[PDB]
Enzyme design. Structure first.
Site, PDB file in Angstrom:
ATOM      1  N   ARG A  10      33.387  43.616  36.966  1.00  0.00           N
ATOM      2  CA  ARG A  10      33.318  44.141  35.611  1.00  0.00           C
ATOM      3  C   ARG A  10      33.586  43.091  34.536  1.00  0.00           C
ATOM      4  O   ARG A  10      32.921  43.075  33.493  1.00  0.00           O
ATOM      5  CB  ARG A  10      34.302  45.294  35.448  1.00  0.00           C
ATOM      6  CG  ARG A  10      34.416  45.782  34.021  1.00  0.00           C
ATOM      7  CD  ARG A  10      35.300  47.006  33.936  1.00  0.00           C
ATOM      8  NE  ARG A  10      36.673  46.718  34.336  1.00  0.00           N
ATOM      9  CZ  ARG A  10      37.605  46.224  33.527  1.00  0.00           C
ATOM     10  NH1 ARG A  10      37.320  45.953  32.259  1.00  0.00           N
ATOM     11  NH2 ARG A  10      38.832  46.012  33.984  1.00  0.00           N
ATOM     12  N   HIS A  12      33.436  39.605  34.920  1.00  0.00           N
ATOM     13  CA  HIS A  12      32.663  38.368  34.983  1.00  0.00           C
ATOM     14  C   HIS A  12      31.196  38.381  35.358  1.00  0.00           C
ATOM     15  O   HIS A  12      30.540  37.343  35.276  1.00  0.00           O
ATOM     16  CB  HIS A  12      33.374  37.387  35.922  1.00  0.00           C
ATOM     17  CG  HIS A  12      34.812  37.178  35.586  1.00  0.00           C
ATOM     18  ND1 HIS A  12      35.219  36.565  34.422  1.00  0.00           N
ATOM     19  CD2 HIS A  12      35.942  37.516  36.250  1.00  0.00           C
ATOM     20  CE1 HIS A  12      36.539  36.533  34.383  1.00  0.00           C
ATOM     21  NE2 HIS A  12      37.002  37.105  35.480  1.00  0.00           N
ATOM     22  N   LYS A  41      40.892  40.902  24.621  1.00  0.00           N
ATOM     23  CA  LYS A  41      41.125  39.915  25.664  1.00  0.00           C
ATOM     24  C   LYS A  41      40.776  38.592  24.994  1.00  0.00           C
ATOM     25  O   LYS A  41      39.641  38.395  24.574  1.00  0.00           O
ATOM     26  CB  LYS A  41      40.205  40.167  26.862  1.00  0.00           C
ATOM     27  CG  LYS A  41      40.561  39.331  28.078  1.00  0.00           C
ATOM     28  CD  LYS A  41      39.799  39.770  29.308  1.00  0.00           C
ATOM     29  CE  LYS A  41      40.309  39.048  30.543  1.00  0.00           C
ATOM     30  NZ  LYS A  41      39.667  37.721  30.713  1.00  0.00           N
ATOM     31  N   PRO A  42      41.754  37.679  24.867  1.00  0.00           N
ATOM     32  CA  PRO A  42      41.515  36.378  24.225  1.00  0.00           C
ATOM     33  C   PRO A  42      40.371  35.533  24.771  1.00  0.00           C
ATOM     34  O   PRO A  42      39.595  34.979  23.998  1.00  0.00           O
ATOM     35  CB  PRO A  42      42.860  35.651  24.334  1.00  0.00           C
ATOM     36  CG  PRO A  42      43.656  36.422  25.335  1.00  0.00           C
ATOM     37  CD  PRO A  42      43.154  37.832  25.304  1.00  0.00           C
ATOM     38  N   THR A  45      34.857  34.872  30.693  1.00  0.00           N
ATOM     39  CA  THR A  45      33.593  34.238  31.019  1.00  0.00           C
ATOM     40  C   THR A  45      32.690  35.191  31.780  1.00  0.00           C
ATOM     41  O   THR A  45      33.147  35.922  32.660  1.00  0.00           O
ATOM     42  CB  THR A  45      33.816  32.971  31.890  1.00  0.00           C
ATOM     43  OG1 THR A  45      34.605  32.024  31.159  1.00  0.00           O
ATOM     44  CG2 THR A  45      32.490  32.326  32.261  1.00  0.00           C
ATOM     45  N   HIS A 119      39.364  36.599  41.311  1.00  0.00           N
ATOM     46  CA  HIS A 119      39.816  35.944  40.088  1.00  0.00           C
ATOM     47  C   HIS A 119      38.863  34.789  39.790  1.00  0.00           C
ATOM     48  O   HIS A 119      38.275  34.213  40.706  1.00  0.00           O
ATOM     49  CB  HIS A 119      41.235  35.392  40.254  1.00  0.00           C
ATOM     50  CG  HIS A 119      42.287  36.446  40.428  1.00  0.00           C
ATOM     51  ND1 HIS A 119      43.168  36.448  41.489  1.00  0.00           N
ATOM     52  CD2 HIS A 119      42.607  37.522  39.670  1.00  0.00           C
ATOM     53  CE1 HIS A 119      43.986  37.480  41.377  1.00  0.00           C
ATOM     54  NE2 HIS A 119      43.668  38.148  40.283  1.00  0.00           N
TER      55      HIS A 119
END
Length: 124
Positions: A10, A12, A41-42, A45, A119
């Site tokens: 979801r 990336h 979300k700062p 990618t 991750h």
């Protein structure tokens, strides 16, 4: 609630586009993927390759993770990606992002059976 593998997809995966062809890509994507529901979300990618291509990275170059873990992998080839970073004039609930399209090697941490990305490390 969400499995790590599902969360990775979801956050990336964006296989429906070859590359971000607009300055508003990130604003739209960050909202669509629900990355600004309670806070902006700062950084995030998105990878513009098939899910199969990204999952395959878990069988490619094993490299160290930014935190010392040894379950990270770097793609043998560069992939089309779009970097999204919160803008200065950005403030929840009105988040604003800068869209940066590029072609680089991605780095992902893999886990489980199947052994899949969970991750996305600092993509080379």
């Amino acid at each position: 609630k969400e499995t790590a593998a599902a969360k990775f997809e979801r956050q990336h995966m964006d296989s429906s586009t070859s590359a971000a062809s607009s300055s508003n890509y990130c604003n739209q994507m960050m909202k669509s993927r629900n990355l600004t529901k309670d806070r902006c979300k700062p950084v995030n990618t998105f990878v513009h390759e098939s899910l199969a291509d990204v999952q395959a990275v878990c069988s490619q170059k094993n490299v160290a993770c930014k935190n010392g873990q040894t379950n990270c992998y770097q793609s043998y080839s560069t992939m089309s990606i779009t970097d999204c970073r919160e803008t200065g004039s950005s403030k929840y609930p009105n988040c604003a992002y800068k869209t940066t399209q590029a072609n680089k090697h991605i780095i992902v941490a893999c886990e489980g059976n199947p052994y899949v990305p969970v991750h996305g490390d600092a993509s080379v």
